[PDB]
Amino acid sequence: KGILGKKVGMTQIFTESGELIPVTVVEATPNVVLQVKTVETDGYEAIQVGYQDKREVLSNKPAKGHVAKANTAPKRFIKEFKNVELGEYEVGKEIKVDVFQAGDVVDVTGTTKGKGFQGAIKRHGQSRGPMSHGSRYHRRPGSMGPVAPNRVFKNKRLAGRMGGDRVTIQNLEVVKVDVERNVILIKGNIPGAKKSLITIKSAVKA
């Protein structure tokens, strides 16, 4: 079980018993199965899924041809889902939020917000140097290594572009499903900026 949606934002919800929990609102306009991959044709089993109808002028003839089989408008996002029952899916089939029910445990994948070039202190949570007592070492990445190798070992973490990575949060709870609004309320917070792509899947650990 899986679906693709757009990270609408964050709010909070009162459960029964009056508890208050943070939820992330993820909207998922019905995704469409654009292609079915099998061991015969591709060597592995999975279904290609498209989401977020795209303006035609924003699409290419090759892209339109690919989606023609499913007989739907061009989709902005396309992703393959594995570990699903291919028998249950066919090109042109629709997937709605109702695939999930409240109380489900899911893995949510997103692309972390990009911070750009960041120093080691922020990027790797390393310790500053003393800010006084004559210190001229505040936000620097520490020693690069011992003398003997005459080089620097790999993974000596340094400043660089931070964020924008594929991150999965495991075992988030599906608080609610609104089919009329194609909304899934997921307990907690999930990676990615608002309007970014989000991938909900049934938790693998479960």
Partner: protein, 122 residues
């Protein structure tokens, strides 16, 4: 958030007035203690006639903090000061009376004697 060297008022009549934190029990690297946590402290100022006396290493439980606690229902409680109660090893308070309001978190932590003696539990 009470940490080592943090000073707290004493919310009982055990004799001590102001204590200083030595440890935050509960873990090897634990840094901070909040309401309902036990600490090892030293008496930096004691009432002249009290049982507990100045310079004594004692255990205490934090009963109210400036940075208070978050309740499961989404509410919060914050106090105007950091106060603790000196206790024996079995959570029994060393003194007989408790001063000022106390946070309700102590109930689930099983400081029932302090909770009963408290003039008010919030």
């Amino acid at each position: 958030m009470i940490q080592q060297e943090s000073r707290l008022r004493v919310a009982d009549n055990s004799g001590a007035r102001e204590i200083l934190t030595i440890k935050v029990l509960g873990g090897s690297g634990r840094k901070t203690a909040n309401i309902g946590d036990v600490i090892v402290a030293t008496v930096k100022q004691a009432t002249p006639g009290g049982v507990v006396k100045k310079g004594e290493v004692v255990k205490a439980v934090i009963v109210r903090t400036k940075s208070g606690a978050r309740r499961a229902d989404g509410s919060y409680i914050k106090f105007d000061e950091n106060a603790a109660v000196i206790i024996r090893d079995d959570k029994s308070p060393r003194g007989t009376r408790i001063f000022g309001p106390v946070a309700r978190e102590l109930r689930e932590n099983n400081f029932m004697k302090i909770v009963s003696l408290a003039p008010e539990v919030l």
